[PDB]
Motif scaffolding. Structure first.
Motif, PDB file in Angstrom:
ATOM      1  N   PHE A 347       0.784  -1.192   0.000  1.00 50.75           N
ATOM      2  CA  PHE A 347       0.000   0.000   0.000  1.00 50.75           C
ATOM      3  C   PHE A 347       0.835   1.269   0.000  1.00 50.75           C
ATOM      4  N   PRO A 349       4.531   1.626  -1.322  1.00 46.04           N
ATOM      5  CA  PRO A 349       5.866   1.305  -1.820  1.00 46.04           C
ATOM      6  C   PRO A 349       6.826   2.486  -1.841  1.00 46.04           C
ATOM      7  N   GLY A 481      -4.778  -7.359  -6.904  1.00 39.43           N
ATOM      8  CA  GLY A 481      -4.283  -7.383  -8.270  1.00 39.43           C
ATOM      9  C   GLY A 481      -2.896  -6.839  -8.339  1.00 39.43           C
ATOM     10  N   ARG A 482      -2.297  -6.610  -7.180  1.00 37.57           N
ATOM     11  CA  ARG A 482      -1.003  -5.963  -7.094  1.00 37.57           C
ATOM     12  C   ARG A 482       0.052  -7.020  -6.974  1.00 37.57           C
ATOM     13  N   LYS A 483       1.296  -6.577  -6.845  1.00 35.94           N
ATOM     14  CA  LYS A 483       2.391  -7.474  -6.570  1.00 35.94           C
ATOM     15  C   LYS A 483       3.461  -6.713  -5.833  1.00 35.94           C
ATOM     16  N   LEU A 485       7.118  -5.887  -5.931  1.00 34.71           N
ATOM     17  CA  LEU A 485       8.206  -5.894  -6.850  1.00 34.71           C
ATOM     18  C   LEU A 485       9.355  -5.059  -6.305  1.00 34.71           C
ATOM     19  N   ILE A 486       9.335  -4.822  -4.987  1.00 34.12           N
ATOM     20  CA  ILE A 486      10.468  -4.172  -4.305  1.00 34.12           C
ATOM     21  C   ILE A 486      11.298  -5.221  -3.518  1.00 34.12           C
ATOM     22  N   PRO A 487      12.590  -4.963  -3.308  1.00 36.25           N
ATOM     23  CA  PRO A 487      13.348  -5.845  -2.427  1.00 36.25           C
ATOM     24  C   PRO A 487      12.589  -6.330  -1.172  1.00 36.25           C
TER      25      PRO A 487
ATOM     26  N   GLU B  57      -5.595  -0.469  -8.230  1.00 39.54           N
ATOM     27  CA  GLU B  57      -5.876  -1.860  -8.561  1.00 39.54           C
ATOM     28  C   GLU B  57      -4.550  -2.569  -8.863  1.00 39.54           C
ATOM     29  N   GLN B  62       3.698  -2.495 -12.541  1.00 34.80           N
ATOM     30  CA  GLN B  62       2.760  -3.421 -13.138  1.00 34.80           C
ATOM     31  C   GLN B  62       2.262  -2.862 -14.461  1.00 34.80           C
TER      32      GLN B  62
END
Ligand code: 2RU
Ligand code: 2RU
Ligand code: MG
Ligand code: MG
Lengths: 548, 548
Positions: A347, A349, A481-483, A485-487, B57, B62
């Protein structure tokens, strides 16, 4: 009156590659007349440049030229010339950094001090104003903060072999010569000591040195086991306080410099749960801020249950960063701290420099299934239901705070606290002792530290973190629907019987560059169960993933 | 119910070079079909990649591919190909950093807010997980901390032109549409507002934009004077506490990240004396720690006079550094703080990254002359004698704390406090008013802040700093053969009638690379008399001398 004190030389005893052993080394490197440099250095004797230096009369940079000048004429009488690209500044620079702490020696100073010995350092040192002076400055905090005293020549205005400095030492030690041992690499530095009746050891190779101490002190020092990382003394910490909101103030302890690192503890703990990682990481090159999380300790613990859902909790930290001036921070959490860290990643990053969890995996919420349903489908999460009804769970925990902490903080090979049928049984401790035995993981005092904290505000607040299942499920579905993608690092504990390491096995589906770490033979209380490997794993991942 | 609220777009209103104006710019740079990029961006409309982004979303990283993909076929139907070294990541990277705060706009948001207006930001933004996400993150704290609210699309899950977000705004503003003004660069974003009855302004060129607001709000906004730097709200600061010694705890306020900077105030002040430099310097790239010095405020103030000689005071800071984990720090002091900083340079260089003084010069002690003698040979230092006899001086200062602070903190062109005959007269204020008028330098509230502090522990402790002349003279003579050869800045105040700028004129004899700064038209209270140039001078010297 036999021994109860221990005094250490710096150059050549607590710190190796000793400078003077470069003094010569160089000469050889450059086909210089044996000792030429070492004469220049001692030139003038008591009334020479180098003593004035050691006394504080002048400073390192002030001395560089006087040395070079001395060197000039040490080589004029030796009927010779120096090289034409010759630099006293470079030599000492390389030398001074070349030099690192002698580990076994320091470890032995710990060992002794651990057993009631007043420890000190006595060293002939200078006022460092070199452009590159910090490197040494760094080393001194690492050392000094493990001793009762650090006595520097240029600070006291006396030098080492001059009697009056030993007198000064005794005075400082509150001691008499026969009560004190003194290790040094120069014999001249030894003699005065003895003349007052001091035990002395000529340090050459380090571990015969240790043999002598070992014996004369009657204490295993050589070959003594690996010792736990440095802990924190709460009274000697910097305590910080940020009111994040009208009636919520968050407390933390802060040590170090560099990229901010935020440690967030799990159910029922305190910033103290990180006692082993604070000095370690600070030392590794970071600014650690170890929170009392909302509900615990010197942070505020407001009654209402909503006040503890992930979403609220998360904004509050974001504010915490805000009001401290930090654009980002690395977030490492444990237990509940784990999940919160995860939701800071998902939420906010822009705020999380990198993210790290001990034990607690990331599970995405099941948007079909209710979570009160979901937990029921699993024998071991039965305790979380016990925690739902406000008040029941608190009376049992608050009833006896010693019994309670003592019953929790126990290592894998050690338990007297089980997991399930907890509602039927009708107590977390329904079937545990009134005076539970000390775990290998905690001193008695440590337990009492915790007892103090929780006398302030009990378990209402902490137990609230388990009472927003519904709300958090909802909040969480927003991020489906997120991911990440940070260390991001997932440290798994073999024998944690609740944050089991299978639970984390699909996490790479939503975190595709997730790095990992894994602790064999480790129960749920990671940071006091396996502190050293914990520190090892974390520092290495910080260095690789969180620096740039 | 007319206006009392003010809402601002981000891209194109509070922050310029707006991203979308690169979107196009690029196309031109690369001979691309006009708008190609901008279609790809809006591709799908409400149900497209970019909205999902803006809604939270999904995330920036992404989205990068979905954009590029969209770009692919925006160019397939346009019967064309993209370049072969084409990068959506680079474009937005350059663009996002290219963009800096629109200064006049922010300044106008301040101006309004300064006059009772509730201020907020409404912006269509995304969850930034780019490898380089901090740059934006940085900008957001700089902004947000000057507003009542920051409302981000991806945070609330609604977007900007959708009604429900405006509803969300009103709700947040505790307001009704006609009480609110809303500035934006997109017309579509304007219309919904109006439909509820909002004042709206289409922002094109920034300063016609301002004209509109200026008028509809009835408040000078354009051409309004340069405004004082950001101050601190004590309740919204991080307060730190280090017990440096059995019964001495030191308090500080901490904001920022980077090289530590320690600010030390002068006679009778508080960390609050640096209110103008804290956000400034933090903002400039530093971690500021502004002390309550020993004797003041929330630091400890022990009775004994010895407890305040320079030497004691200095070790205590060195400890302060120690217990916080800081190997070095930059030291900037004022008034008494000045001299102490100087003695940190002379006695603990390894610890001082660089050194800085406002007003207070470095004078080496005269080893022949007594200092009680030395002060007597100078009309203006007559007050220091008045301060010697414990108690006399305190009753007069404590008698009325408002009167007292109000009588001190006054600017050059402003005085009702004179310098000499102070002993004969038999009062510092013997000849000043009971209700002294407010200085241009201080609000009423500010004075009361000080009044709170000094109600805690009075002037015993602070006045003690003047009561170790002898001891400090002695201590100081130890350093008579030394020099300051570390980065060091001497800022002189024209009209400070005690720390007169001639007194500093030989300092280059003992500090040979001393850089300088000089404030015209500036009384003794430098930091609240000329805050902006003070900030200007300090940040520039930090950047040049204290970074590497
Ligand atoms: C996805 C799930 C695993 C998750 O994030 N969770 C659920 C589990 C939670 N941790 C705990 O329940 N920890 C814990 C700690 C102590 C106890 C106690 F000692 F038994 F009381 C019991 C449980 C941490 C957050
Ligand atoms: C070398 C000398 C100049 C030096 O370092 N000093 C001596 C002077 C000292 N500063 C002050 O005396 N400041 C001051 C501040 C306020 C007042 C008062 F407001 F008059 F009371 C009077 C004096 C600062 C330290
Ligand atoms: Mg030695
Ligand atoms: Mg815009």
């Amino acid at each position: 009156m036999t021994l109860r004190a221990a005094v250490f030389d710096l150059d050549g005893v607590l710190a190796l590659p000793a400078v003077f052993g470069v003094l010569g080394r160089t000469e050889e490197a450059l086909a210089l007349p044996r000792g030429l440099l070492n004469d220049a250095f001692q030139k003038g004797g008591p009334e020479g440049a180098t003593t004035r230096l050691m006394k504080g009369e002048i400073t390192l940079s002030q001395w560089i030229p006087l040395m070079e000048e001395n060197c000039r004429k040490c080589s004029e009488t030796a009927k010779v010339c120096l090289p034409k690209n010759f630099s006293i500044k470079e030599i000492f620079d390389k030398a001074i950094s070349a030099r690192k702490i002698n580990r076994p020696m320091l470890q032995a100073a710990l060992m002794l001090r651990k057993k009631g010995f007043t420890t000190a350092i006595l060293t002939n040192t200078w006022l460092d104003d070199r452009a590159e002076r910090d490197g040494l400055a760094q080393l001194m905090c690492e050392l000094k903060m493990h001793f009762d005293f650090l006595i520097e020549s240029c600070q006291v205005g006396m030098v080492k072999p001059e009697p009056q400095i030993y007198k000064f030492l005794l005075d400082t030690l509150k001691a008499s010569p026969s009560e004190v041992v003194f290790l040094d690499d120069i014999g001249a530095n030894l003699k005065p000591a003895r003349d007052l009746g001091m035990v002395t050891i000529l340090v050459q190779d380090t571990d015969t040195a240790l043999k002598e101490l070992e014996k004369v002190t009657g204490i295993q020092l050589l070959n003594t086991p690996a010792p736990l990382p440095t802990s924190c003394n709460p009274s000697d910490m910097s305590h910080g306080y940020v009111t994040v909101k009208p009636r919520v103030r968050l407390h933390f302890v802060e040590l170090g410099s560099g990229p901010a690192v935020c440690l967030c503890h799990g159910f029922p703990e305190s910033w103290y749960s990180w006692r082993y990682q604070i000095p370690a990481l600070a030392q590794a090159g970071y600014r650690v801020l170890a929170m009392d999380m909302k509900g615990y300790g010197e942070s505020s613990a407001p009654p209402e249950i909503e006040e503890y859902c992930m979403e609220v909790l998360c904004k509050e930290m974001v504010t915490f960063l805000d009001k401290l001036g930090l654009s980002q921070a690395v977030f490492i959490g444990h237990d509940w701290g784990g999940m919160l860290v995860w939701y800071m990643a998902l939420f906010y990053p822009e705020r999380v420099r990198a993210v790290a969890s001990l034990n607690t995996p990331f599970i995405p919420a099941n948007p079909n299934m209710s979570p009160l349903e979901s937990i029921k489908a699993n024998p071991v999460f039965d305790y979380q239901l016990y925690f739902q009804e406000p008040g029941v769970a608190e009376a049992e925990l608050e009833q006896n705070l010693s019994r309670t902490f003592k019953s929790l903080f126990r290592a894998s090979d050690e338990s007297v606290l089980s997991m399930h049928k907890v509602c039927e049984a009708g107590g977390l401790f329904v079937n545990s002792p009134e005076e539970p035995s000390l775990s290998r993981m905690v001193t008695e005092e440590e337990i009492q530290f915790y007892v103090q904290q929780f006398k302030k505000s009990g378990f209402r607040g902490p137990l609230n973190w388990y009472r927003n299942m519904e709300r958090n499920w909802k909040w969480a579905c927003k991020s489906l629907g997120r991911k990440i993608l940070i260390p991001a690092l997932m440290v798994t504990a073999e024998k944690d019987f609740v944050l089991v390491p299978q639970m984390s096995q699909h996490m790479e589906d939503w975190i595709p560059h997730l790095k990992r770490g894994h602790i064999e033979d480790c129960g749920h209380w990671t940071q006091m169960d396996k502190p050293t490997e914990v520190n090892q794993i974390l520092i290495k991942w910080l260095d690789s993933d969180a620096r740039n």
